[PDB]
Write a protein that binds this ligand. Structure first.
Ligand SMILES: Nc1ncnc2c1ncn2[C@@H]1O[C@H](COP(=O)(O)OP(=O)(O)OP(O)(O)=S)[C@@H](O)[C@H]1O
Ligand SMILES: Nc1ncnc2c1ncn2[C@@H]1O[C@H](COP(=O)(O)OP(=O)(O)OP(O)(O)=S)[C@@H](O)[C@H]1O
Ligand SMILES: [Mg+2]
Ligand SMILES: [Mg+2]
Lengths: 432, 432, 159
């Protein structure tokens, strides 16, 4: 159907619009199809437009190949004729053929590599790499995305735009109504949000609490904590979910039997995702490490998170800047940018906590300028929230939540709101 | 391709003002092609207008030739249709063919003079120049080109630049009286313009307002954003164009009936351009990718942007520098220079927004030195706008836009101008 | 490392316990190693215990075959020792080797499938899986590794 592929590329604009990038000369033939595709792609990169049949002939005249393939291409361009088909079945056929041919090429090369490796040391060649090439080429043939985007035309793409407007998809709601109503839709996927509380002001508690909340919403959660060990956070999640205690996890006031029973009674609910907690040494974690983690999760554990959580992003490493070549500001901003880029590249909700300078420590109000490490990070951040705990407020077993950085709407809509933080149970709740 | 150029001269009026002068009878052929060119050139000489096909066969029968040549010209005149291929591709192919024929006739001249050189002087013809007259002819053989690569010639092309000064030269109206006033012609093509402002002040709203104005002016707009986009600025364009406040969009006030009506109504308007909004990862969209994006836009779509917008800026991650620059001076300035150079190469209006340092995050007035980005960036700029929003300005829902880097005009007597920035509809409303 | 693998399976207990199901008859060799590990698995299944050298010798004696490989199988069980090496290094190397063997087997099977495809359809053994089965085994080839157990899951790690 390669003739059909070429014809629908040439005479149909939407067809070429669908899949140009996954078109490559080694997908067609060792003869006329490859040569004509090469000519077409040369035109593509030379003039940045769809060649006309006349343009095809023009390029054909200024050719270098000899007579036989010249006549073959002439016939093929003569064979190039438009036919009426559908916008859907053609996609399925073209992809099927792409996958088939990619697998054929990969397996052909595999045979060549195997043969070379079978030959005696004198007879074999360094031209064909060793068997080590067998696994990498195979995964390549299976890493073709078959899916690409171009951008959102404001006029041409209003249908799905209104579909989103009514649907409000990609904004995952919270389990607490105050946050949903101040965000008006919950939390967007490619978003990074930070909390500023201070030192032992409820940071990790809020992080694990929100992790549990989203996990209860049938969601794949990733809670990567560096300052806190996975087991410690596992215990915090035990306290939040099982709702027994933290002071009872140690000096166990609860039987293993009832713990197991409530564990099973939570296991039956399909309304719960998968959450795995990972820990790394301070300043030894980078975005590339996180990406490789995601890759191996999908490969071996077939897991892909959506609400990825990083504890105190400020103790990661940029993987670009050399080792502490500057102060906190630069590396902090760079890490913020890198992690937000990864999150939007994976559409995974990103949350973290930022330090507060000693000037705002033990203060009833915290401002944006009260940030400790950097100011580029507040620029990079979306929907920063400030958690304040006062002696009276702590005695009320609550904290005050203020908006310092808004993205989903007005900041002054509901500036002050309280959380019933339970240090004992590791869970904050609305006061209503 | 002779038929192609003939048909385009006959039919494409646009392909007659670009290059008529570089048409010569000896370019075409020894066959009927030069005869047809002589016929049409004679018609152009007698009547300064493109003769029609009937006028063409009238000249053919009017002019007397051999039966073989009569039939040959008869076949050529019988092969001419519109066939609207690419303008740039057409002109480049014609340039290539003209160069080919120039070299061909130069080769004929040199071989014939060389053959005439060896024979005795009695057999020599006084008409042929001596063998020492080869280079200038070869020079004038290779001097054949269409572009004025010589560049401007002062005191000689003063007519063309006078026509430019008369009315408006290469420029784009801002759709607002005050902006065009302070530019006196709007913004010029190929110029690098920046709109620096504070974090969350007037930046994205201004970008969307300008994009909406340029689209309403029928221009092709390309909004490349490193922030959240394809749905976020898209909603802002909905607010500016459809006059629907964002909160209404979120709450679903529209019934999708009036939405569809407005969309198709704007589709009815012929004064609307094409706008493509594309979002790319933070730190991975270089100028090289930018050019490839332009190529893809022109390939998959019939789109060549007239205006291009950038968000936040400095996110291009220019490949010129491998590592982050300490103060980002080299990197940011390189990005700005590449943007301006690309705009020149495309002769397009490029807009972006710079960052303001922490020193002026709350200052009632912003100086040029109040630049979070590099100091070399406010040197490659051509039009540096700066907006400030204060509590008073928020109360008035206005701003205090200030002009700097006034390359278009003088940076005086207009800097104290204010706009009714609409926080609900994402647009600028200059006071009348 | 088949010597080391068989020695530690016989001798080391945590070695056997760690990844026993991660051991297939085709992981080892087309020759005497396959037969010896067949005896190993036979004694494991018949007796839910770690066989002694004498036990497997008795098994090979009673469960015999033609003498051409009988010498090979009897001499193969003559070298397995204690050899107190590193457990982590052991499991890493074994996983690497088993991945090599899985790649080899998937490759060869794809070779056979294509070879039958590179044959007149009438003269093709219908029993063999067809070309459409070629991609999936590739996935099956790559979806073979030891559980690193990276990270902790709050739910299934309650034990
Ligand atoms: N181990 C603990 N024992 C008792 N109470 C605790 C313990 N950990 C936390 N709390 C209480 O719960 C609150 C919330 O602490 P977390 O948010 O879990 O930690 P954190 O504030 O992120 O810690 P750092 O060290 O400042 S990053 C604390 O301020 C205490 O009131
Ligand atoms: N839909 C909207 N409703 C109300 N105000 C809006 C809306 N969109 C934008 N604005 C206002 O316009 C500005 C939007 O932020 P910008 O000035 O574009 O800064 P920014 O690009 O978000 O900055 P950073 O540094 O990248 S977070 C702020 O003053 C907002 O209050
Ligand atoms: Mg913490
Ligand atoms: Mg913005």
């Amino acid at each position: 159907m390669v003739e059909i592929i070429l014809s629908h590329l040439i005479f149909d604009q939407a067809y070429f619009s669908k899949v140009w990038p996954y078109m490559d000369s080694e997908y067609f033939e060792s003869g006329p199809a490859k040569n004509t595709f090469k000519l077409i792609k040369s035109h593509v990169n030379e003039y940045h437009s769809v060649p006309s049949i006349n343009a095809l002939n023009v390029a054909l005249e200024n050719s270098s190949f000899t007579e036989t393939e010249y006549s073959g291409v002439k016939t093929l361009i003569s064979k190039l004729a438009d036919s009426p088909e559908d916008h859907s079945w053609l996609v399925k056929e073209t992809e099927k053929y792409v996958q088939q041919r990619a697998m054929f090429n990969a397996t052909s090369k595999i045979i060549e590599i195997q043969t070379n490796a079978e030959l005696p040391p004198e007879k074999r060649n360094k031209k064909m790499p060793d068997v080590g090439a067998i696994p990498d080429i195979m995964r390549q043939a299976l890493s073709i995305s078959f899916d690409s985007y171009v951008g959102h035309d404001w006029m041409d793409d209003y249908e799905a735009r209104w579909l989103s407007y009514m649907n409000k998809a990609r904004k995952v709601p919270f389990k607490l109504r105050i946050l949903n109503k101040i965000t008006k839709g919950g939390a967007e996927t490619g978003t990074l949000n930070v909390l500023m509380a201070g030192v032992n002001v409820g940071k990790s508690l809020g992080l694990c609490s929100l992790a549990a909340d989203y996990l209860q919403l049938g969601h794949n959660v990733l809670y990567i904590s560096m300052e806190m060990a996975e087991e410690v956070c596992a215990k915090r999640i035990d306290a939040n979910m099982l709702d027994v205690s933290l002071d009872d996890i140690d000096d166990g006031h609860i039987s293993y039997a009832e713990y197991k029973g409530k564990m099973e009674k939570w296991r039956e609910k399909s309304t719960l995702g998968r959450l795995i907690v990972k820990q790394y040494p301070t300043g030894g974690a980078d975005a590339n490490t996180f990406r490789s983690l995601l890759n191996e999760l999908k490969l071996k554990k077939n897991f892909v998170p959506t609400i990825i959580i990083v504890d105190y992003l400020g103790i990661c490493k940029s993987c670009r800047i050399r080792v502490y070549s500057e102060n906190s500001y630069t590396t902090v901003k760079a890490i913020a940018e890198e992690l937000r880029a990864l999150a939007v590249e994976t559409e995974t909700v990103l949350w973290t906590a930022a330090q507060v300078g000693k000037q705002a420590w033990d203060s009833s109000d915290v401002n944006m300028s009260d940030i400790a490490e950097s100011a580029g990070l507040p620029a990079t951040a979306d929907f920063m929230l400030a958690v304040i705990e006062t002696e009276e407020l702590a005695a009320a077993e609550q904290q005050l939540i203020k908006q310092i950085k808004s993205r989903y709407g007005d900041k002054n809509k509901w500036n002050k709101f309280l959380m019933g933080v339970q240090k004992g149970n590791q869970k904050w709740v609305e006061i209503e």
